[PDB]
UniProtKB/Swiss-Prot annotation, chains A, B, C, D, E:
Function: GTPase component of the eRF1-eRF3-GTP ternary complex, a ternary complex that mediates translation termination in response to the termination codons UAA, UAG and UGA. SUP35/eRF3 mediates SUP45/eRF1 delivery to stop codons: The eRF1-eRF3-GTP complex binds to a stop codon in the ribosomal A-site. GTP hydrolysis by SUP35/eRF3 induces a conformational change that leads to its dissociation, permitting SUP45/eRF1 to accommodate fully in the A-site. Recruited by polyadenylate-binding protein PAB1 to poly(A)-tails of mRNAs.
Top-rank lineage group of the source organism: Eukaryota
Additional note from the record: [PSI+] is the prion form of SUP35. [PSI+] is the result of a conformational change of the cellular SUP35 protein that becomes self-propagating and infectious. This conformational change generates a form of SUP35 that assembles into amyloid fibrils. [PSI+]-aggregates sequester soluble SUP35, resulting in defects in faithful translation termination by read-through of translation termination codons. [PSI+] can be cured by GdnHCl and by deletion of the molecular chaperone HSP104, which is required for [PSI+] propagation. Present with 78900 molecules/cell in log phase SD medium.
Spans through the membrane: none
Designated name of the protein: Eukaryotic peptide chain release factor GTP-binding subunit
Subunit text: Heterodimer of two subunits, one of which binds GTP. Interacts with polyadenylate-binding protein PAB1, and TPA1.
Gene: SUP35
Family per similarity comment: Belongs to the TRAFAC class translation factor GTPase superfamily. Classic translation factor GTPase family. ERF3 subfamily.
Amino acid sequence: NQGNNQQNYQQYSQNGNQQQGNNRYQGYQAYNAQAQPAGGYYQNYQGYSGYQQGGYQQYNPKNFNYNNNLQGYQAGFQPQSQGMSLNDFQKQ
Amino acid sequence: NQGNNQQNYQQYSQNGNQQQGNNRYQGYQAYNAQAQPAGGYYQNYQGYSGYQQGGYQQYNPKNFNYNNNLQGYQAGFQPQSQGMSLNDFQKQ
Amino acid sequence: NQGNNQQNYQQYSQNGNQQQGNNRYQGYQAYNAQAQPAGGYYQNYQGYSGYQQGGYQQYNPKNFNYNNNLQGYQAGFQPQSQGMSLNDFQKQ
Amino acid sequence: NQGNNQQNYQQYSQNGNQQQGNNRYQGYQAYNAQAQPAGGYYQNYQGYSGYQQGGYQQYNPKNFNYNNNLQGYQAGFQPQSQGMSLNDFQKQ
Amino acid sequence: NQGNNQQNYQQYSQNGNQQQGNNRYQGYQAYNAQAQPAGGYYQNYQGYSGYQQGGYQQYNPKNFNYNNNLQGYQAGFQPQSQGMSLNDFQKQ
């Protein structure tokens, strides 16, 4: 093994659990607009975990732009540009 | 093994669980607009996990643009451009 | 093995579980517009996991644009362009 | 083995489970417009998992555009263009 | 083995399960417009998994456009074009 290496390794185990019954679950989701409502009856919850964004790795024994967007909000980007740019984010 | 390497390795186990019955589940989802409502009756929940975005890896013993968008919002992008650009994000 | 390598390896196991019965499931989904409502009765849930987006890998012992969009929102893109561009995102 | 390599390897097992009966499932889906409603009675759910988007891999011991869109929304794209472009996303 | 290689390998097993009977399934789907409603009575569900989109792979020891769209929404694309383009996405 020699050189660059980006490794994402996640080990998750949910095995050997007992959940008893007789449960009453009433879930009301209504009139949601541009939303992601989450809910429920859980015992073991593993979620939204293990995120890896790689980076610069240069191994040696013209405009470059690299953008990694994970679950993010990016608006109004003019990198390495020539001219005039107008970005208006007025909130009233 | 020699050179660049991007590896996504996820191991998940849900094996050996007991869920008892006699359960009452009433789920009401209505009048959702541009939404992703999530719910339910769960015991072991593994989700939205293990995301890997690769990066720059250069191994050596003109405009370049690389964009990785995972579950993201990207609006108004003019990288490495020449001229004039108008991006208007007014909210009233 | 020598050179670039992008590998997505996911191992998932749900084997050896017991789910008891006598369950009452009432699910009401109605009047959803441009929506993806999710629900149900679950014991072991593995979903929306294991996403890999490859990256730059250059092994050596004119406009280039590379865009990877996974479950994302991309609007108003003018990379490496010459001229004038108007992108209007007014919300009233 | 030598050179570029993009490999998607997913192993999923649901074998050896017991689901007891006597279940009552009432599912009501109606008046959905441009929607994908999901629901049901589940024990082991594996879905929407294991997505791989390849990337740049260059092995060496004029306008290029590469776009990978997986379950994404892309509107208003004018990469590597010359002229004037108007993209209007007004919401009222 | 030498050169570029894109391989999609998925192994899924659901073998050795017991599902007991005496079940009552009432499913009502009506008045859906431009929709894909999904539901039912399940034990082992494997679906919408294992998607691979290949990428750039160049092995060496004028306008090019490559677009891969999987279950995606692409509207208003004018890459590597000369002139004027109007794309109007007004929602009222």
